[PDB]
Amino acid sequence: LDKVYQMKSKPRGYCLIINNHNFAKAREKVPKLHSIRDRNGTHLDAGALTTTFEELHFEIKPHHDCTVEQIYEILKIYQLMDHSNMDCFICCILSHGDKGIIYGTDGQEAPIYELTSQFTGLKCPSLAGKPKVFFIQACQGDNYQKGIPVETDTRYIPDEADFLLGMATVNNCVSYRNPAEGTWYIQSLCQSLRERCPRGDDILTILTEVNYEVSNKDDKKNMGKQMPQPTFTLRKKLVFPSD
C-alpha cells in the first residue's frame, strides 16, 4: 500500500545549526589557510534555516563559531541524547571546506564521514528508523564547475539507513556564498522548502528543484556554476507538515 516517515511529535526534532563565521584562528595557525577570508553573510542563512525549520516545528539549537574539536563534542552530545519523542533529526554545517572535509574556526579539517557516521543506528539507537538529515554548506575543491549550453527549459534494518545528505555542491568544486543575500544552496533549500512543504511534497522532490535553481544561478564574474548533489539511503518519503 504505502509508507511515509512519521512526523507527528509536536517537537519534531533538533536542528544543530553550526554557523561558522570567523576563521582568524586559522589564518594564523594553519599556514595554507592564511589567505582565507571570513564567511560574511552566513548569518542570513543561519537566520534563514532557523525561520524555515521553525514553522516546520523544529526546536532549533544554534551554535556559534565552532572549532573542529568543539564540533565533534557538540555532535557527541546530541548522540547520547534520547530522540524517542522526536521523529526526525537535522544537522546543518556552514563553513569553508575541501575534498570531503569541513574546516572549523580553528583551521583543521574534519571528514564528513566522521561527522555523519556519528548518528548511525548503532551509535544512536534512539534515531534508528527515524530520518537523519544533514545539510553541508561548504566548498569541496578549488575547481570551478563549467557550464554547458542546454538550449531549452518488529524486525532489524541496516545500520546506515534513513540518511539524507544535502551537499551544497558536487565534489571537487566550489560553493557560492553571497555576502548580501546569503548562499545559493541554503537559500534555495529554504525558498524551495518553505514553499513546497505546505503543499505536502517530500524532500527528495524539493531537492530536485533546488538543483534546478542553483543550476541557473551563475557567477557573473568567473563564469562559474554551482551544482548541488544530495545522497540518500532513505526508506520512505520524507515530509514535514506544519501550520
Binding site: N40, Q137, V174, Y176, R177, N178, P179, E181, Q191
Partner: protein, 293 residues
C-alpha cells in the same frame, strides 16, 4: 579556499615613498616592465624631489605588502556585494641608474653612457618628444631619475627598486606622470603609499574630479564624487553606485558602491593613500606634496 590567482597578469604599479630620517626619504617603485622577461635594454624615467644618494633592489614580497596597506584603506569605502566562496651615476650589472638635474638631462640627453645606445636615434628620438617634455619644466630643478633595466633583471626575485634620496625644498613628487600620447587620454593603474606629507585638497579635488571610472554595465549606474573629512581622515574619491534587488524572498534592495578611486589621508598618522585603479583622465601630471615642515 583557492590558489590559482595573481600571476602573469598582476602588474599595475606600486609606489611607496616614506621619510627615513631628517632629510632622507626612500622610494620603492614596482611597474609592469620590471616584472617581465626583458630581452633588450629598457628605459624608464621619473621625477624625484631631490637627488638619489643610493639605489638598491628590494624583495618582491614588498609589492604585496604595499598594495595591501592601501587596497585595504579604500576597501572600507566600497560595498562590493559580489559572490564569494569557501652628473651622478649608480651603475650595476643588471640595471643602471642615472640621476641628473632635470634641465641638464634635456641638454645632454643623447649622451647614453647608460648604454641605451643600440636603440639608436630611431628609439631614443621617441622619448624626447613624448616623455622628456613632461619631465623638465620652468622649475629647472626637479631631478630626473634615468633607469635602464638591462636583460637579466628577471633572474631571481627582488625586482622592486628603491631610491634613497635627499628632498630639496620639503617637496615630494609622487611620479604618476605618463608618456604624452597622441590620443589625449591617459589610463591610470596605480596604488601609492606616501607619508609624512601635508594634505592638499586643492590638487586632489582637481585630479579625482577629472576621473572617468570603469563601467559596471548597468543603466542605473551613477558616478558620485565625494569629499569626506572624518575623525582622523579626509577622503576625496569617486565611486560608481547602483541599487540591486533580492534574488529570492523579500524585496530588499542592495545599494552598491564600487570602483572607488581617489585619495585618502590619515589626519593623525600624516599618511597618504592613493588609488587610481583602471581610471581614465585627460590629466597626465605628477602629484607634488610638502613634507611635514
Amino acid at each position: 579556499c583557492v590558489i590559482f590567482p595573481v600571476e602573469i597578469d598582476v602588474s599595475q604599479t606600486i609606489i611607496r615613498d616614506c621619510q627615513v630620517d631628517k632629510q632622507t626619504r626612500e622610494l620603492v617603485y614596482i611597474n609592469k616592465i620590471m616584472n617581465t622577461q626583458l630581452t633588450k635594454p629598457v628605459l624608464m624615467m621619473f621625477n624625484i624631489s631631490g637627488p638619489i644618494r643610493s639605489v638598491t633592489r628590494k624583495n618582491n614580497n614588498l609589492r604585496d605588502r604595499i598594495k595591501s596597506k592601501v587596497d585595504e584603506q579604500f576597501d572600507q569605502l566600497e560595498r562590493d556585494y559580489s559572490d564569494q566562496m569557501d652628473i651622478k651615476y649608480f651603475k650595476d650589472e643588471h640595471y643602471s641608474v642615472s640621476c641628473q638635474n632635470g634641465s641638464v638631462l634635456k641638454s645632454k640627453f643623447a649622451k647614453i653612457l647608460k648604454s641605451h645606445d643600440y636603440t639608436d636615434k630611431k628609439s631614443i628620438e621617441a622619448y624626447e618628444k613624448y616623455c622628456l617634455p613632461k619631465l623638465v619644466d620652468e622649475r629647472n630643478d626637479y631631478y630626473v631619475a634615468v633607469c635602464v633595466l638591462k636583460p637579466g633583471f628577471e633572474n631571481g626575485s627582488n625586482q622592486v627598486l628603491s631610491f634613497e634620496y635627499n628632498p630639496i625644498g620639503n617637496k615630494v613628487i609622487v611620479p604618476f606622470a605618463h608618456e604624452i600620447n597622441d590620443t589625449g587620454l591617459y589610463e591610470y593603474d596605480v596604488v601609492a603609499y606616501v607619508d609624512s606629507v601635508q594634505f592638499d585638497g586643492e590638487q586632489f579635488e582637481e585630479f579625482v574630479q577629472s576621473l572617468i571610472l570603469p563601467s559596471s554595465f548597468k543603466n542605473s549606474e551613477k558616478v558620485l564624487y565625494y569629499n569626506e573629512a572624518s575623525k582622523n581622515k579626509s577622503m576625496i574619491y569617486k565611486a560608481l553606485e547602483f541599487t540591486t534587488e533580492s534574488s529570492w524572498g523579500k524585496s530588499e534592495k542592495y545599494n552598491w558602491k564600487i570602483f572607488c578611486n581617489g585619495f585618502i589621508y590619515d589626519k593623525k598618522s600624516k599618511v597618504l593613500y592613493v588609488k587610481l585603479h583602471n581610471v581614465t583622465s585627460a590629466l597626465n601630471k605628477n602629484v607634488i606634496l610638502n613634507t611635514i615642515k
